[PDB]
């Protein structure tokens, strides 16, 4: 289990939590020195528990699938809450057995469905470490409209920051003040599968991508990643989704 406490959190304890989250996910190989996540794990071993504490010290436990860093559900007090999708139901068999009741949230956990349920696209929700504290407080009391907005903050400040060093840095700049994500952060989030696939297929193709990944950058718009010497590959992406899961 990894843990993060927002009381007394600053940019470096947060980097320390994201470091431990990354280091808790099992891998067999490194492709171009990036951890390649396993095709499948079976049993309860497939799930990582993160214990998150807000400013006041209340907590929620979040369950993450270690093969893809996908947030499946969470436990708040005695109630477990799971996304309405097949993998989250499978997950409810291994985690939070101890809950007095299990509620299925009325949406799956992908971004389109959560934005629709929240009433705001990601681009309009301030993220940062104050927003994470808020999100933990919202998840402690069931409301599905407000839980969709809090889960969008929760995915990006934990799972997306683990996947990309650039997003982790974005959240460390937002440690005492929230701010909506840059288009670059949204671009990166959406490209993890694509980028993971091409870095994998680039082995045996001299580090060259079969098809270029296009991202918008930290100045404005439209950028094509064609090979593994790009800084996106050498410095930014931190975990790769196994091609068997794409």
Give me the active site residues, please.
160
**CA distances, 138 to each of 125, 143, 150, 154, 180 (Å):** 15, 8, 7, 11, 19
CB of 176 to ligand FMP, least distance (A): 25
User: 68 vs 238, which CB is nearer to ligand FMP?
Assistant: 68
Q: Interface with ligand FMP includes 74 (CB under 6 A)?
A: no
Nearer to ligand FMP, 31 or 155 (CB): 155
State the minimum distance, in angstroms, from the CB of residue 143 to ligand FMP: 18
The two tokens of residue 165 are 């060093």
Among 38, 71, 139, 184, binds ligand FMP (CB under 6 A): 71
Pair 210, 240: CB distance under 8 Å: no
Binding to ligand FMP by CB under 6 A, coded x per residue (else -) over 127-156, reads: ----------------------------x-
Taking CB under 6 A as the criterion, which residues in 7-66 touch ligand FMP?
none
Strand ranges across the sheet with 79-82? 2-5, 47-53, 59-65, 70-76, 79-82, 101-104
Q: 14 vs 107, which CB is nearer to ligand FMP?
A: 107
Handedness of CA 179, 166, 45, 108 (dihedral sign): positive
Q: Give me the residues paired with residue 34 across strands.
A: 31
Could you tell me if 192 and 241 are in contact, meaning their C-beta atoms sit under 8 angstroms apart?
A: yes
Residues 174-213, interacting with ligand FMP (CB under 6 A): 189-190, 192-193
Q: Does 159 bind ligand FMP (CB under 6 A)?
A: yes
């Amino acid at each position: 289990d990894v843990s993060f406490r927002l009381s007394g959190a600053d940019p470096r304890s947060y980097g320390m939590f994201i470091k431990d989250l990354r280091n808790a996910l099992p891998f067999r190989e490194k492709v171009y020195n990036i951890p390649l996540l396993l095709p499948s794990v079976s049993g309860a071993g497939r799930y990582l528990l993160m214990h998150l504490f807000n400013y006041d010290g209340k907590t929620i436990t979040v369950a993450v699938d270690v093969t893809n860093v996908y947030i499946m559900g969470y436990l708040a007090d005695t109630t477990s809450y799971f996304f309405n999708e097949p993998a989250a139901e499978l997950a409810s068999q291994y985690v939070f057995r101890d809950a007095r009741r299990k509620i299925t949230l009325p949406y799956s956990g992908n971004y389109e469905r959560l934005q629709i349920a929240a009433g705001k696209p990601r681009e309009k929700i301030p993220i940062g470490l104050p927003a994470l504290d808020s999100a933990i407080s919202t998840l402690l009391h069931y409301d599905s409209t407000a839980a969709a907005g809090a889960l969008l903050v929760l995915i990006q400040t934990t799972a997306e920051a683990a996947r990309f060093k650039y997003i982790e840095q974005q959240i460390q700049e937002r440690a005492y003040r929230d701010e909506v994500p840059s288009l670059a952060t949204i671009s990166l989030e959406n490209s993890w599968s694509g980028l993971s696939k091409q870095i994998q297929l680039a082995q045996g193709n001299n580090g060259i991508f079969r098809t270029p990944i296009v991202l918008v950058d930290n100045k404005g718009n439209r950028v094509q990643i064609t090979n593994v010497t790009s800084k996106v590959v050498t410095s930014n992406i931190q975990l790769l989704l196994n091609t068997r899961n794409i």
